[PDB]
Design a protein around this ligand. Structure first.
Ligand SMILES: [Mn+2]
Length: 440
């Protein structure tokens, strides 16, 4: 008698009907797994710093939680982890970089409670009573990103995390195409995949082409340059460093960097000597010899840029003639603050470097990249996540184009329970879900 699985549940607690705050619960009989535990920055809400998922359902069932599996070190994947760990004790699995960044987050909140970290890579197989869990490298804007593969007797449940495909990224950004093909060939029962850019035809612009266009843009800047991006966009940061070196500009960080210091020590960045300067040293240089990378005190870049624009920032403000490169991907949640910030910058006499119409810059696969993942995985059932409802619908259309049966595509809201019993996949239950608002 071999152990066989009977009942599966997939429950989004965050990351659907929105693009951040990923958190997906998978249950296989009496074992429960949490896939990601992200935060989201507040929508144009009052006195809120961050929003995290309501995990009451997990707390009610906490004796069954076997682990928290983190795909990558960005706030969309790990921003709620410290808050989850206050409520429940479970092991935390993630790549070496992901684990280091979670530790830094715990340290920043002065949480001294013991945590069971377990570093994993693409050769790790974690064995539980009901299932085994394996991992594969993905391409994203932070290295050491992993997809998660839960092996069941019905086939695999694959969670992509956030990903794209771009042959100009290498090393710790290279995707495990052969391992992914093997997972697909062996049989995927359900694919849970990132819908963020599912509305956008084609492919993301390759990062080499982006870097070349950034060079051209930056070369035209006559005064100071401020780059606004996520601290977790290591690709963009590296590009800025490269370009600064070529243009004889110094680089200074404005924002909490913790992430950079940790990643540099682990060897993730290529940094010229004498390139980086402390932020208090910037006013000592000519304006045309500095780039400031402004990533946000809390990790939210547009808030920091808004402060600078309105001359409200504690450390450094915008001045007339400054140029702004906004390297962020707008969401519905953010479109008001972005619009307001752009207006504030123009009022302040700053120059916003235009979007190139020929460039589509994102960290998430556009249609053809999502189709590539669908065609490699060949899932039986499909659950588009990480998106507003319209993105999830666009992704569902891609799945149907690739051959997924339309009746096997599930469009879910937070708290919905997709369930399988070996006979039928249903959506017939809801659990508690929602937004927990966090301030200072
Ligand atoms: Mn991400």
């Amino acid at each position: 008698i071999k152990k066989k699985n009977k009942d599966i549940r997939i429950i989004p607690l965050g990351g659907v009907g929105e693009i951040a705050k990923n958190m997906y619960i998978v249950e296989v009989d009496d074992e429960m797994f949490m896939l990601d535990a992200g935060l989201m920055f507040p929508e144009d809400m009052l006195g809120v710093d961050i929003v995290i998922p309501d995990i009451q359902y997990v707390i009610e069932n906490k004796e069954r939680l076997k682990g928290i599996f983190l795909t990558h070190g960005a706030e969309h994947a790990i921003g709620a982890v410290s808050y989850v760990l206050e409520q429940i004790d479970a092991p935390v699995y993630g790549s070496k970089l992901t684990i280091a960044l979670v530790k830094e987050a715990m340290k920043a909140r002065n949480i001294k409670k013991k945590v069971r970290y377990y570093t994993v890579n693409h050769d790790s197989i974690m064995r539980f009573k009901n299932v085994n869990v394996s991992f594969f490298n993905t391409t994203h804007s932070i290295p050491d990103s992993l997809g998660v593969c839960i092996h069941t007797s019905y086939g695999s449940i694959v969670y992509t995390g956030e990903f794209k495909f771009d042959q100009s990224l290498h090393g710790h950004y290279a995707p495990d195409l052969k391992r992914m093909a093997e997972i697909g060939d062996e049989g995927v029962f359900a694919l849970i995949s990132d819908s963020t850019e599912a509305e956008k035809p084609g492919y993301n612009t390759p990062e080499n082409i982006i870097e070349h266009h950034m060079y051209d843009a930056f070369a035209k800047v006559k005064g100071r340059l401020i780059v606004s991006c996520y601290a977790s966009n290591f690709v963009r940061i590296q590009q800025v460093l490269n370009i600064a070196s070529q243009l004889n500009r110094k680089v200074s960080f404005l924002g909490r960097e913790s992430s950079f210091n940790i990643a540099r020590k682990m060897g993730y960045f290529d940094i010229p000597k004498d390139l980086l300067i402390p932020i208090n040293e910037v006013e000592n240089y000519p304006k045309n010899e500095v780039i400031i990378i402004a990533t946000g005190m809390q990790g939210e870049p547009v808030e920091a840029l808004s402060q600078m624009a309105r001359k409200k920032h504690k450390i450094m403000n915008i001045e007339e003639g400054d140029s702004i490169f906004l390297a962020i991907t707008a969401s519905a949640n953010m479109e008001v603050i972005i619009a307001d910030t752009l207006n504030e910058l123009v009022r302040a006499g700053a120059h916003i470097i235009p979007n190139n119409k020929k460039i589509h810059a994102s960290s998430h696969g556009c249609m053809e990249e999502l189709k590539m993942m669908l065609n490699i995985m060949k899932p039986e059932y499909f659950v588009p996540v990480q998106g507003e409802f319209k993105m999830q619908i666009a992704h569902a259309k891609l799945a149907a184009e690739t051959g997924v049966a339309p009746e096997k595509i599930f469009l879910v809201e937070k708290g919905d329970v997709i369930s399988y019993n070996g006979k039928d996949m249903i959506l017939n239950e809801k659990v508690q879900s929602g937004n927990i608002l966090i301030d200072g």
